[PDB]
Write a protein that binds this ligand. Structure first.
Ligand SMILES: [Cl-]
Ligand SMILES: [Cl-]
Ligand SMILES: [Cl-]
Ligand SMILES: [Cl-]
Ligand SMILES: [Cl-]
Ligand SMILES: [Cl-]
Ligand SMILES: [Cl-]
Lengths: 378, 379, 376, 376
């Protein structure tokens, strides 16, 4: 009955009969006495854990959904979902998804799984990719990175379900604060909670959030058997960062808008990429599906080698991951997109001077000034 | 350089050669080997710990100050500062300061320290209480709880420093987001970091932030000898919550204002105390000395017994403590100020029907709606 | 510096500058590149110094060049299984751990061939390793809950003549009692959740091995599957490890005490414990195990199993094993209530079989609890 | 009930719902009162179930009705001392811990008299309680660094003749070895930082005692001065506690081996150890506790102590003690350093006196490190 953001603080809190703890106590026990228990359902830590369940309930609540399942990492959430794709079945996706994600395509490719890449930023190449024989899953990551292009979740989901296939959105980029894939018509939202949700760069995690109860059983059976389960202490940490998730996200957003305007005024900056610009080729889709433009910005550096620019920052940290409280900068060409080749990256239209910013919660004008000195050099 | 809303993130965050950790590691070791450093400075966890030291630089950094020292609790921070008042010396304070402080004041009185309570809102009552012989320490807590009256730190410090007295401000209530005691002319800011600084209701800590190097030495020697140090994991949790202190406080303040409006609108609400109201009894001081007027609210409930009001809240948690992520309601006559003396209450202000809100970060409209329908009960 | 010293200083990977004796806990998911010279710390799923110290410690215990830890024992097993391709054979035992068999099932449902075998006789082992396309031989020894014991050296020699990797699930024994690599295996598999962490407060897995190309494949899978343990999780396992040898020998010594009172009891029939003389594989236990472990099983003759379980006041009724708190369970109700009663009678698992997991409590108190509980 | 079951289960809970064997970690500072029947929990500094669990466990180790834990040993000590009123005297062991003398100087500053005594002779124990208004008799045993011992029962006999309070700082022996309350003292003081927690990764203190009015005052003090430990820290101490007995048993057995090694080295003079016949209270040693401990001191004869300290390659060069990692220190140069030159030698402390704190590493490993060190 209550509202998001109240959900962030109390959503799947708990209550704690016995003592009245407001913050639920941390359940580290691997084992349980089955005689105390007036109705046995906590057996063993890999299967059942109170702290882990609270995090799950919280996450499910953020999306008005019946089920969530958390994992040791974002990659483990993806690996679990992908595991359900059978040989002689087909995962429609895109040549531009996350590199770890593409690795789970690689591994899947050897279990009779056909990976059909095609384009989903248009209607046109949606229908063909969808008419693929034996197609089981459609895999959308939106916005994409580092190009910050998007995919119309509702329309892709309309055309996919027409074929009784499953649609997952990797929603890590935007967080549930900004984008609600299940609301848009997707069947699953996938998160690396390592980013935004936990939000302090001090714990690894993944989550799936969904409604299908058949899917719920297959997912929990896999997690229990594969054992890709997170620790209780790490569920505590992810749960902790959640309270401030929307406060952090909109601080991150506001600063992003600032830096984009700083960027658009630099003589040594070419293209600036940001889902919320009026020039963005899919501005109608961003406005239709995202509540705000996000914490990530990309741009073409013109003032010389990216490698030299990277060092000049004296506030942004250079490094990988995103969404953390500390602002980060990277050159995908040198870092995140290193494993792809240039003509690859070039097909992608990822130049070697593409710079990516992940915006933290520091003072906006502090971040703007570090960016400007860095660009200016000297 | 760096503004406050950046120092929260990067204060106390020197890197770490070899590995490059963005978040510094948690130093749990109580124990050190000589030969691993090049001169001897880490001998033992009680005296020295990098994680504790990192939190300290951050806290000091929030007030543009040389030193900070953190503690096992706000009470411990208070006990430490108080320990530096010798037998025969007089502490001037108020009869409405936090009890934990006064309980501590009682402890001092039995060692030969004498204690004097004082209204610190009037030129005379300030100028008189600051004529207390052998004055050594002026203990200012502003806003005072639960009534949210306010004391002019600059003025009171512009007269204590004439008597040869050190001034502390328990700045727990406002946090260094909203009030800057050292800038206002005080010598020490005291914090329970247990409240808004840690801010997630999952760790205790205190802090003292100051400038006097002579004081720094005395403060560390006591913490070392008394042993009231926080643990590493706890310093980590305090340090972690502090990242979002600015974002949290401003949300908390934004909602407090909404609740204050809801309160003012209600026919079963009498007095409303809030430092931001055009008729707060110290609006000019609040105007000049804080940047926003805080996220605690108090009010007289007219609709029946206070207990019955408390049960009717479905989102507000009933508990003592304040400033954490979860909104809390209490009745000082039943929760905090409870054990008092029913004749005395009327002097200090604390009424039967007095209710105190500590505003969190849930949706302002959710909290407002919970409040409005506790106020409507009558069974 | 020897083996009890391995537990304390194993990988106690230094603290340049501050001098910390206990290494600080590295929780950062990420790393400033610039902050290291030749940057090789990038992202926590791939790199983490706390995890590395634990792995280095664990490998140290078997004098192995490598180790990799995991979010759970299941994850360790799943990683090793992932290297077997469809059509290839994994040879093992019907009475392997139910988590493992689920993983066999997953793999079987991918086309990998899982072949179960008797692995305790000469005939039975040739009738195992003869399968064509044999890439993996999976030994759990001792096997739980009947405490049978497979000859690791002999099975390893035979498996290797067809080029098959041999893994030993050494969770039951721990590396203080049994060393699979020294015995001939290629991989030691662990649920550190059990006796290794020792305190029943953290789930973890590990693999310990000696081949560098195996190493690369294991790390590539862990990075991609993302079945990595947490920083704080690793700290708890590491901290547990320090006392592993002390705890293990306390548990074994108490196990031996409990075995005699059991065999003395008129409401107890058969008793299982690898260290008894009449154990059909008694030569093998001697040769390959420095002590016979701290797991005990027995046939209970004196009333329904559920009532026996209800009479303990020191032992706890639950699962996992190897921890400091002693546990009891009844396989037919708890490890295998979900079995065909049919497949129960022939696994040698009676409806009244009781398993003890011995902790570190006073042996007198545990013996008293057991005795009054047996109510003989 | 015997002395190792209480380490595991003392203060350990069911979870009237979930059944957690290891009780969950209560990090909350605040408590939704509205539920709790007749209210127990109001605020963290005053109440916390995790903290209480540790207290029940510690009290159980000496079957005392009460225990209170603190941020540190100093804090436990500071609390006990605050109860002494201005103008009263504390009789104490003159080679007490400096931190205690630091607190002693606080009470020296805060009105109290600090008066040490030879606590080892009748012809001076009596003339120590001769002090007017004797509040506290403060014993630490064995002492540092010469390991002299004080007869707890005898000193208590005459201290109680005056109606005073007797505390024993019992950190050194731990409750595994020595039981001050059983011996006749009123309070046991611990630095749980040392062998109790046991792994050098948490600070802590404890008081264990039996009188309800001391209990009220101790708790009133802790709540007010706020020297409270965190919930996670209490978790670490409690977790380390499980193995305290196994660890102490181990450290003692190794200490004895080291003592034999030392006695045979031509560069060793006097050796101090509570378990040698030559120790002047070796008789009292035998009386008042079960195994002579994990601390050993000796005069190095090869010149400056730094010569020796620098040669160890397993022993860690630094302070604290009782932990899993063996430590070596030099008191004249570290713990006992800053005492000048016209002093120190009354505490019998020479400039090549060496103190070992024995961890759990392999004994022949520790024995070998000490050998090369001694024989550069
Ligand atoms: Cl929208
Ligand atoms: Cl008094
Ligand atoms: Cl001053
Ligand atoms: Cl191999
Ligand atoms: Cl089960
Ligand atoms: Cl007493
Ligand atoms: Cl004895």
């Amino acid at each position: 009955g209550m509202r998001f953001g109240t959900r962030l603080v109390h959503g799947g809190r708990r209550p704690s009969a016995g003592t009245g703890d407001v913050v639920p106590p941390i359940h580290v026990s691997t084992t349980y006495e089955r005689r105390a228990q007036d109705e046995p359902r906590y057996f063993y830590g890999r299967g059942e854990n109170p702290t882990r369940e609270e995090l799950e309930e919280c996450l499910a609540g953020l999306e008005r959904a019946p089920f969530a399942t958390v994992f040791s990492s974002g990659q483990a959430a993806a690996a679990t979902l992908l595991s359900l794709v059978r040989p002689g079945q087909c995962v429609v996706s895109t040549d531009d998804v996350y590199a770890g994600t593409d690795g789970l395509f690689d591994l899947a490719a050897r279990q009779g799984v056909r990976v059909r890449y095609a384009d989903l930023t248009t209607p046109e190449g949606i229908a063909a990719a969808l008419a693929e024989p034996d197609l089981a899953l459609v895999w959308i990551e939106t916005p994409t990175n580092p190009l910050l292009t998007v995919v119309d979740v509702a329309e892709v989901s309309r055309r996919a379900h027409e074929r009784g296939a499953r649609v997952v959105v990797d929603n890590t980029f935007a967080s549930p604060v900004l984008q609600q894939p299940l609301a848009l018509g997707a069947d699953v939202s996938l998160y690396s909670t390592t980013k935004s949700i936990a939000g302090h760069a001090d714990v690894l995690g993944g989550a799936l959030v969904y409604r299908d109860a058949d899917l719920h059983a297959a997912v929990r059976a896999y997690r229990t058997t594969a054992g890709n389960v997170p620790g209780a202490l790490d569920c505590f940490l992810v749960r902790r960062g959640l309270h401030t998730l929307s406060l952090r996200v909109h601080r991150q957003v506001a600063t992003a808008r600032v830096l984009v305007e700083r960027l658009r005024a630099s003589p040594v900056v070419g293209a600036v990429h940001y889902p919320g610009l009026p020039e963005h080729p899919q501005h109608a889709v961003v406005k239709a599906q995202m509540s705000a433009p996000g914490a990530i910005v990309s741009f073409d550096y013109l003032g010389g080698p990216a490698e030299r620019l990277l060092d000049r920052f004296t506030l942004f940290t250079c490094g990988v991951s995103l969404g953390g409280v500390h602002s980060l900068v990277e050159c995908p060409a040198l870092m995140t997109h290193r494993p792809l080749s240039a003509e690859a990256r070039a097909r992608r239209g990822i130049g070697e001077s593409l710079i990516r910013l992940s915006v933290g919660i520091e003072d906006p004008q502090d971040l703007a000034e570090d960016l400007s000195r860095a660009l200016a050099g000297g």
